[PDB]
Amino acid sequence: SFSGYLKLTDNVYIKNADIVEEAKKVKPTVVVNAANVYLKHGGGVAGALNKATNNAMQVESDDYIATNGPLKVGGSCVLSGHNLAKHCLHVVGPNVNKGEDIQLLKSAYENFNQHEVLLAPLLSAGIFGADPIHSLRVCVDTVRTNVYLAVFDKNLYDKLVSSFL
Ligand SMILES: Cc1nn(C)c(C)c1CC(N)=O
């Protein structure tokens, strides 16, 4: 199962890890992707997860968008986890670099509550432009299911742990 995690709360755990390497090692039931409404997995966690699937995630995602249209900011969809997990929960957090409402980050984390355990990144952090300390706070105050957070950047991981209330 999950190893080397620091316990933050009853249900939130955190580790300085590459989420792709973590997924390949654990092969969890659910890996969360930091998706955009179009499921265009270009950069950040999405680009890295998609690249690990040899673009199979993008092919599947384009078929999903052709049938269903775009997701909502704060919304999600469950697709295949390919070689990384049983399922991938594509969750759209607000992108602050696109003027999206930061209040939608709580709605985005509510999607995690439909899954008993998840491997996930911090929503809206990184190239999405939100403060990762705020994202972790919304995560622990919103998610009630077991979430194992993978934070790629060591310096950010240390800052998140040392500032966690
Ligand atoms: C992979 C990966 N794992 N995690 C947690 C992040 C933020 C990434 C994105 C990247 N390094 O391209």
UniProtKB/Swiss-Prot annotation:
Superkingdom classification of source: Viruses
Cell location: Host endoplasmic reticulum membrane
Stretches assigned to the Macro domain: 1-165
Catalysed conversion reaction: Thiol-dependent hydrolysis of ester, thioester, amide, peptide and isopeptide bonds formed by the C-terminal Gly of ubiquitin (a 76-residue protein attached to proteins as an intracellular targeting signal)
Record membrane topology: Multi-pass membrane protein
Regulation of protein activity: Inhibited in vitro by GRL-0617.
Functional description taken from the UniProt entry: Responsible for the cleavages located at the N-terminus of the replicase polyprotein. Participates together with nsp4 in the assembly of virally-induced cytoplasmic double-membrane vesicles necessary for viral replication. Antagonizes innate immune induction of type I interferon by blocking the phosphorylation, dimerization and subsequent nuclear translocation of host IRF3. Also prevents host NF-kappa-B signaling. In addition, PL-PRO possesses a deubiquitinating/deISGylating activity and processes both 'Lys-48'- and 'Lys-63'-linked polyubiquitin chains from cellular substrates.
Assembly: May form homohexamers. Interacts with N protein.
Protein name: Papain-like protease nsp3
